Amino acid sequence: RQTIVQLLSHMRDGKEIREYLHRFSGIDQERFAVIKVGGAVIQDDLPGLASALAFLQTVGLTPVVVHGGGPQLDAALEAADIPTERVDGLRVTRDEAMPIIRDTLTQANLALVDAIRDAGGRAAAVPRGVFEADIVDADKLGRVGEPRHIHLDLVGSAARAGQAAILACLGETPDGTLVNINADVAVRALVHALQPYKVVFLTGTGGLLDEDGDILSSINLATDFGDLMQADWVNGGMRLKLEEIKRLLDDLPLSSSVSITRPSELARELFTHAGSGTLIRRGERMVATDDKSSLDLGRLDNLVKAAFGRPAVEGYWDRLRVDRAFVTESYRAAAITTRLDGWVYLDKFAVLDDARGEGLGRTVWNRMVDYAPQLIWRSRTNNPVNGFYFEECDGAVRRDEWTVFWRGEMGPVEVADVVEKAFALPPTLEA
Amino acid sequence: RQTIVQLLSHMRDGKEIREYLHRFSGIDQERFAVIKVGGAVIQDDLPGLASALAFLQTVGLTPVVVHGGGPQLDAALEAADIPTERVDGLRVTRDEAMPIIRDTLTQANLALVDAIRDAGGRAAAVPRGVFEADIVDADKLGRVGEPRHIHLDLVGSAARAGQAAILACLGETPDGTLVNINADVAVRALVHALQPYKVVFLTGTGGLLDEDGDILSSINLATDFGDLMQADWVNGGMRLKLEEIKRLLDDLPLSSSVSITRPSELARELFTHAGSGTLIRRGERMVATDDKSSLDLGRLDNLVKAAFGRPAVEGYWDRLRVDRAFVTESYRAAAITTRLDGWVYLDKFAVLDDARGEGLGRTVWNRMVDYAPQLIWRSRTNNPVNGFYFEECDGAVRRDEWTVFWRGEMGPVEVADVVEKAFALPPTLEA
Amino acid sequence: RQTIVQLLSHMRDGKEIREYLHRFSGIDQERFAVIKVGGAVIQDDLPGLASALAFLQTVGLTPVVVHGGGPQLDAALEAADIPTERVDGLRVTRDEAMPIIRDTLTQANLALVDAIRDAGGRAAAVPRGVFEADIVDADKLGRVGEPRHIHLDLVGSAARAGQAAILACLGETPDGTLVNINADVAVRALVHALQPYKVVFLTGTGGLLDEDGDILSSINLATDFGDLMQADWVNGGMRLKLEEIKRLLDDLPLSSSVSITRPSELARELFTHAGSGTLIRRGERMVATDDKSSLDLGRLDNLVKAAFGRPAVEGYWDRLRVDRAFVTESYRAAAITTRLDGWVYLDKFAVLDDARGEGLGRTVWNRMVDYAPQLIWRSRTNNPVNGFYFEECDGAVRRDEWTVFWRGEMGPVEVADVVEKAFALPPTLEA
Amino acid sequence: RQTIVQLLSHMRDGKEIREYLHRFSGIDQERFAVIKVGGAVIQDDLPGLASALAFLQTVGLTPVVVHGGGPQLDAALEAADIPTERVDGLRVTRDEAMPIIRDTLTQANLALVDAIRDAGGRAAAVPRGVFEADIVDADKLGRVGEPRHIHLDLVGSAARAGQAAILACLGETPDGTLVNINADVAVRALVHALQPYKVVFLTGTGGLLDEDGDILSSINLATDFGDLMQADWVNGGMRLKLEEIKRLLDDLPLSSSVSITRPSELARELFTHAGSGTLIRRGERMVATDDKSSLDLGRLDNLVKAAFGRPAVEGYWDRLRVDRAFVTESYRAAAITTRLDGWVYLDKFAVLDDARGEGLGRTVWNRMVDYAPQLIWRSRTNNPVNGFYFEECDGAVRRDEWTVFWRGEMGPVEVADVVEKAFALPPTLEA
Ligand SMILES: NC(=[NH2+])NCCC[C@H](N)C(=O)O
Ligand SMILES: NC(=[NH2+])NCCC[C@H](N)C(=O)O
Ligand SMILES: NC(=[NH2+])NCCC[C@H](N)C(=O)O
Numbered sequence A, B, C, D: 001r002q003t004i005v006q007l008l009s010h011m012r013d014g015k016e017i018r019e020y021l022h023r024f025s026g027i028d029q030e031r032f033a034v035i036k037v038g039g040a041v042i043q044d045d046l047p048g049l050a051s052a053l054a055f056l057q058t059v060g061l062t063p064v065v066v067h068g069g070g071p072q073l074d075a076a077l078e079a080a081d082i083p084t085e086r087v088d089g090l091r092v093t094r095d096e097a098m099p100i101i102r103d104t105l106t107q108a109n110l111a112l113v114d115a116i117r118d119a120g121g122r123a124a125a126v127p128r129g130v131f132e133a134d135i136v137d138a139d140k141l142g143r144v145g146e147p148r149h150i151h152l153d154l155v156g157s158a159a160r161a162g163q164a165a166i167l168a169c170l171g172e173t174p175d176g177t178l179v180n181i182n183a184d185v186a187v188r189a190l191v192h193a194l195q196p197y198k199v200v201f202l203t204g205t206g207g208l209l210d211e212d213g214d215i216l217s218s219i220n221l222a223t224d225f226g227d228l229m230q231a232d233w234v235n236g237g238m239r240l241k242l243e244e245i246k247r248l249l250d251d252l253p254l255s256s257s258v259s260i261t262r263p264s265e266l267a268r269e270l271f272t273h274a275g276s277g278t279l280i281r282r283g284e285r286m287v288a289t290d291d292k293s294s295l296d297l298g299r300l301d302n303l304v305k306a307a308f309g310r311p312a313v314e315g316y317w318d319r320l321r322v323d324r325a326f327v328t329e330s331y332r333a334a335a336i337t338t339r340l341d342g343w344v345y346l347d348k349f350a351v352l353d354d355a356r357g358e359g360l361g362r363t364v365w366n367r368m369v370d371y372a373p374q375l376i377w378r379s380r381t382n383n384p385v386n387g388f389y390f391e392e393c394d395g396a397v398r399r400d401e402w403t404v405f406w407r408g409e410m411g412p413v414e415v416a417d418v419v420e421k422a423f424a425l426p427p428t429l430e431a
């Protein structure tokens, strides 16, 4: 950590790393992150899981880990004594099953603690003592319980000691009787009590998938929630997650987020803007209008001045046409279309880096290219957004100063004429 | 850890300290020590007790600690709760006074862990989940259990990371129920489980007390147990600690000793032969004989050679008188008396380094001066044994090469006679 | 050290980074690198220079650094000293101005050592005692020396301690006399002695410049040396650096490369294929042929298979057209152009990982596009070479599975035809 | 070191270690200690030397070590080139001899550095660059030099880094010429420039010897110098040390000291009052008077009160006889004799702990036993001074509360009467 005092200047993307670090170091205690890792992960990828969690804990951060026991107990060691795996409301365990669950959750818990230590970091075994539960479901569900309180003494002790606290889903009733707590109801209680700035689900998949097969980078629940639930291509398992994640995020401050990655990406996910998994925030709504009057042109001047680093030319704003503008509620990202020969033309796309990390730039760019299937725009040849534009474009012409892109399905010869006019437009920002 | 291999060879004793460091660095995990510590010490001397256990840790050792709830739940947190301290069997807990118990011992437990971390050491909170217990008492005692099995899972994980396992006296049952376990029976089944090299009692009292209020340095149960049980000065409570202490040591190897101290004296107690408290071993028998033919002169000569670093002069043995010889069953410590102008004289006091530390040098010495109230003996002025002789003498005369000691108050005018005769005597050893 | 093996495998590239780590950890001692850093660099950017070298140290590498004293002694401490900057042979120092040099470079030396230590890294001041030198100039220059022997005493011990050996350009003679050594001959004699895997030049300029002022990424002396010296755009001073760079590389193994950078890009330059500066290797020869029979279709069949991860389809080679083939002497990098409607088309561009990193892919590509100013080609949409193709193309069209590029500014209406033929084309590779 | 935040409470002598630690930690820079170790030590005992030095440097301390190369150069690598080892004034080195001394002191320097680092600590090789010397002794002495200036640039760097700086006796003239510096003249030169709190000589023997063969613990130059020089049992070699040592301390503040131990003793030496070798201070003069008026009875009451923790009984002073009083100039240690049945009797012996650490208690006690060959005194049986008394006694009788000692050659029958009177003296102090 002292040997990471100025080990913050050189990695393959080194400057926004600093800022993500100096933000998770707003510790309070263990209010940094509640990381839920499934039973499947500790079995099929324990080293990678460990290195990833242990990496954090050397750079100062101390997550609170909750692990399940899916494959471990719900199979490998509870089909063994031919007990068989009945699943009622969401999980039944008769009194006979209890001592096996006890011994196999504790075994995974310690398996992980040691893995973290052996990987360079520090962990703290907390199988029990956190979850105080009620039992009301006796003949209904058996010995499964619902959290009434969270003792955070053991967890706090761990943070002060610089140790990732490792929780196992074992609970205790008021009068000390043991109980099996389901891993989801457990995470919820903990996220509630701790109010973490970050909730991470480490899965083997590495994030929710979109209609095309790709990983869904950002989800902005304010605009995207309805669209997803309603969709035909979203399978039952994705909707329960989203509905759950949203239930979690509605119980946290706006600054809290959820990430869904695989252990290997976890650092990429937490320490760069672009991320490396699925980010899900409550997010913010957007205005789609063609009435320039309504927009706060001052805040836009600011947005452009910050995003591009240079200001818009004198009297660019009141002289501007506007075919449609898309601006996020906070004026931290915006897309502004004009018209060029009757073609929709993207005149400004401005997104502050911190807005880019929350997925707002994509929230804006998607509503924009949804209105404009056939889109033409340009970008300086040095612009770092060029890689993003090129993944989104369908064609491009490249000169020594500007590069014109286009979207839609038009044979190159069709857009050859509008392209030349875009190269000959005056600069709307100096330098 | 590694930054410790030197700290020590320069100490006030730094020669036999090397000896103890290696002896104790036969880890086998947590088989180094079991350290019972009453509730009274954690309350009244948390900082020093924490520094003690920290010290052990920095030097590379990892003890298993067990704390009780004397001046805590059996006072403080149930004297202002109106349950009234129920004492029947030896420690009764109703169901009502059970969730009181859980959190009283749990608070103590973390206080200890942080205090140890505060003082520079590594420790690990293991509040519950070790003692698997049978609830045999029903209504007569309440919610008290007796360890049928010991889950050393959590203990092991601590050790590997080099941590002191701070256990609490809370237990499970076959079917979950949180149950109270009294400290001593906990320590018994735990010592039986771990087979530690060293059982340590930390009390404020600082040791065990002898007839005249001094600290009883050592007890050798082979020879001393019967004596200590039938002496009237030994109070009924000391006749209890001793019996129970016997039960533990009868369940350990002969190499395993029990020590009783206070936190500030623990290091001196562990890392010196001299000790600093009350060592109690199973030890070994001793013969007291006047017939020389009934001894093993071969083993004695080995002993003399090994102990003094020089061998006995020619024919010393065939020529040796022998008023009374006191040799311990293993010939690792022996005292042999002759006669001198009628007075009893000590010709040989031979103890091997290791034997001195098991209190065998003392055992033999104590039996000899019980036979020889009036005793004369001598010692080269560089015998490091001089300090102990001095502490045992009633007088001394000093010349350059030898020093004559005597003992048993006998009017220093008639001792001028026997002192001179003692200086005159031919050597019986060379160099 | 141990707390480092993971930091990186999660990076934006974290896969080719493992390789160079493995490569740079063929220790021997200080044979990883020799890093010359000019005087102007320690004065104007001391912190950045130190974070760069500190980073290396944390990663487990220990470069041998050699610093000069441009804007220090050859200015600062002798422009208000009246000795007047004598420059004749190439670096003159009289007898009087020798103790000025001594305390100037050493001050510089410790400014560097402490700065490195401040940024978290380990370093060792070696102001003198490495360079045993011959006073070859007499009265013509004064007290300037030529390295006869390199004493690696201090350097080896630095390395062993995980330290950057910070050498200064001061040397002895056979009989003691302290003598001045100019930085370049020092680096030459040092590289010859150390035979490092890597020679690195740190300047503020950040690399070497091409015809149009951009940074020249790679130089392959085999093909490029003659071309560059007879180039009129390569200035007389740049023609000197290259000459000396050859001389260093001709005395090193073929695996020993040279980099020229600025401190901020040092990590990227060393741990990625793409680099971030100017690489210079001895490299290898390249054939350019239009005759298919002058090629080894077996060896190309391997190259292609290894580059794409898939094998060329059956009979592809016997059937292959071939306008021009560009294959490097070791068959690790090749481009094969065919014909398509009169246009030159690139059927295969195959570069192996190591070859990409030695700048051989660049070598082939550049020789290919100098023969084919007007070029058409395609690439699957998930080819990571796409980014590079994009930086080189003048246009591109994108469908789901493939993407067509073209090159050489030629009015996007006449290329609409040959693009279709390119998408139409049957694959020549499978999976 | 953080793991020595509270690792300062338990060792075989735990309370005065802290105080020495918090005193050497007044560093300024490298002003703590200049440690001279002869060539003989690095040859015949390098591991022990290193651990001894590595311990300092891990507890915060940064000594500056100067080593010679006695056995190394005066043999190991310089009888080899048949040069013969001539010693004029005190050391001659012809021009031919220079390059061997260089390579063999340097080889010794790194041998020491690597040894320390392998032993846990941190060091900084400074074979050359510290001693700037003059040569005026050309054909007389050859290439030997006497320090004219001390560059501490390298030494301060080592201190800041927490590195024991390891200096070799190699010098440099104004014009860079190499030179052989004698190890004694260098230490003289270095102590002058650094003004250390401590000057330590690490030798194989382990401290100066007294007339009896034992190690001489204290020398109080104000009182002991003249007495030693003059003595018959002090050989010429002991005289040259004493002359040199005095020459050093006379160039340091009164607070400086010299210790002469062996590496194995060095910690005991610096961190306890008793030490473990020979300590030498400029010290302070003494009053031996029989006029009670002249003594400052105010300052004496304070002394007794501090040294004993209890005050002298009401009217002990004005009723007190005083046969002779021995008081150190600062009233920090004192011996007061009265008369008892015509025998000299030591009524008070009082020494503040810190004065016992500067050797004043022994200075006071030495003039005392010189005045009183036949001395009787007493001391409580629990007094830690008893072991010192017993080493100094000629006889002693012991009861359960007090113990009477005596000096001189008197058969028990001669002192049996007075001893009884010493047992019956009133306590002249309360509690
Ligand atoms: N899938 C993503 N785009 N994630 C972006 C993550 C942004 C930010 N570093 C965070 O951890 O919250
Ligand atoms: N009370 C005593 N004198 N104990 C001696 C202790 C010797 C050794 N350190 C041990 O723990 O067994
Ligand atoms: N200027 C460049 N393209 N350099 C490439 C660097 C490749 C490799 N990492 C090396 O250091 O040799």
Ligand SMILES: NC(=[NH2+])NCCC[C@H](N)C(=O)O
Residues within 6 Å of the ligand: D020, D216, D217, D218, D257, D259, D269, D270, D271, D272, D273, D274, D275, D276, D277, D278, D279, D357, D358
């Ligand atoms: N030979 C002695 N008695 N030395 C005493 C040393 C006292 C003190 N610890 C010091 O280092 O200065």
